[PDB]
Amino acid sequence: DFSITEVEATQYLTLLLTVEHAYLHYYIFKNYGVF
Amino acid sequence: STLEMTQPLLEIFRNKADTRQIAAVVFSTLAFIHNRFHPLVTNFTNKMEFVVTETNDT
Amino acid sequence: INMRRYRNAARKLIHHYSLNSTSSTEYKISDVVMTMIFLLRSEKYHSLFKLLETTFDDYTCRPQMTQVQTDTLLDAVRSLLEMPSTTIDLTTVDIMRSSFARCFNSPIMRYAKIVLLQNVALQRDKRTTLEELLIERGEKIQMLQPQQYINSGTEIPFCDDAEFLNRLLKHIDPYPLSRMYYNAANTMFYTTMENYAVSNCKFNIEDYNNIFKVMENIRKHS
Amino acid sequence: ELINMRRYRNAARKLIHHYSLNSTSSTEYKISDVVMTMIFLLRS
């Protein structure tokens, strides 16, 4: 009984994909250095 | 749900008056993704002082 | 004369052009015409109408206007849009004006020649790419210390009652989540890259496509 | 005396709009704002 808006749940979702995309680069760097 | 959620997420991010919550949200999301990808992971917690970017030139 | 209906239609056009509405099939010429008629018959907006008229390359002569006038105009704009909740650079609107100049000069016929291009309009830029960008970045970044951090019980928050969560599950259940991705996320991301037009970075889909070959790999590894 | 009746009214109008019409959680709004609403009511 929390009234979570369907619409704003969209934004709640959307960031995650960007963040994951970043996570990819983070992992690559952490495993293989700057270059 | 454990978070000081501050539900109006967009306007919270739109506040600018504080950055602690922004940074904590970022970090926590990072941890979330990491623990997704692997079941048993963590990051050193002491401090990671971070940045806010203000303009296209930056 | 149904000024009201005319406006009701018209709005959507500018609404889309200004900001990438996840609605579709906005196009029609009649709607444009009614828009122009409304603007003509809206004295207060005649300034905007006469500016938008300016649509010819050899005569591109958008007049100087005092900041006062410009602000009043932006107020008008926002009000009529019923979206004062944010304000967008006049530059965006002028870019859309240049887009409309494209449309005008294009005698596009029965064939649905969707332009599909991201807006190219901009002035006095220099051609740039990731090279120039990187070269720029370093100093602008390193010149400033990060603001702050403090601990707040940071370490590894975790899940809670599955049934507690099932509450929210059931709340969430009906929605077109499978579509939600297009319904905002992807469209907004792809449209965000007008920043490249800002300072004329030549955006290339030719890597943006990489997502596609990327996604195969999960199916490869079953 | 010193009152910002104008902003009190504005926040109160916004409140009452969403509150009595959308019939959904007032997560954006706070007790302080409700209080200022009653202030405006009492003086209006």
For chain D, the C-alpha Rg in angstroms (whole number) is 11
- For residue C94, CA distances in Å to B34, C11, C55, C79, C195 come to 43, 17, 10, 19, 15
| Interface subset of A 3-32, CB within 8 angstroms of D | 3, 5
The residue written with tokens 């004062």 in the block is: C84
Q: Whole-angstrom Cα distance, residue C18 to residue C93?
A: 6
Q: Whole-angstrom Cα distance, residue C61 to residue C123?
A: 13
Contact predicate D8/D34, CB 8 Å: no
Q: Whole-angstrom Cα distance, residue A10 to residue C178?
A: 11
Q: How far off is chain B from D29, nearest CA to CA, in Å?
A: 10
- For residue A23, CA distances in Å to A11, A15, A27, A31 come to 19, 12, 6, 12
Contact predicate C203/C196, CB 8 Å: yes
Which of the residues A14, A20, A25 would you substitute to probe the B interface, choosing the one with the greatest number of B C-beta atoms within 10 Å? A20
Resolved by: cryo-EM
- For residue D33, CA distances in Å to C103, C144, D17, D26, D36 come to 49, 38, 14, 11, 5
CB contact under 8 A, A23 and B33: yes
For C35, counting Cβ atoms within 10 Å of its Cβ (0-12 exposed, 13-18 middle, 19+ buried), the class is: buried
- Which backbone phi and psi does C3 adopt, to 5 degrees? -45, -45
Which chains have at least 3 CB atom pairs separated by less than 8 Å from chain A? B, C, D
The CB-based long-range contact list for C6-14 (8 Å cut-off, 24+ gap) reads C6/C34, C6/C35, C6/C37, C6/C38, C7/C38, C9/C34, C9/C35, C10/C34, C10/C35, C10/C38, C11/C80, C11/C81, C14/C81, C14/C96
- CA dihedral sign, ordered C127, C133, C137, C139: negative
CB atoms within 10 A of CB C77: 19
Record the tokens describing residue C84, joined without a space: 């004062």
The residue written with tokens 């704002």 in the block is: D33
- Which backbone phi and psi does B50 adopt, to 5 degrees? -130, 180
Q: Which chain D residue has the Cα nearest residue A1?
A: D25
Q: Whole-angstrom Cα distance, residue C201 to residue C127?
A: 6
Helix or strand holding residue C195 (H, E): helix C194-197
User: Cβ contacts of residue C82 below 8 Å, gap of 6+?
Assistant: none
Q: Which of C137, A12, D8 is nearest to B1 (CA)?
A: A12
The CB-based long-range contact list for C44-53 (8 Å cut-off, 24+ gap) reads C44/C76, C45/C76, C45/C80, C47/C73, C48/C73, C48/C76, C48/C77, C51/C97, C52/C97, C52/C100
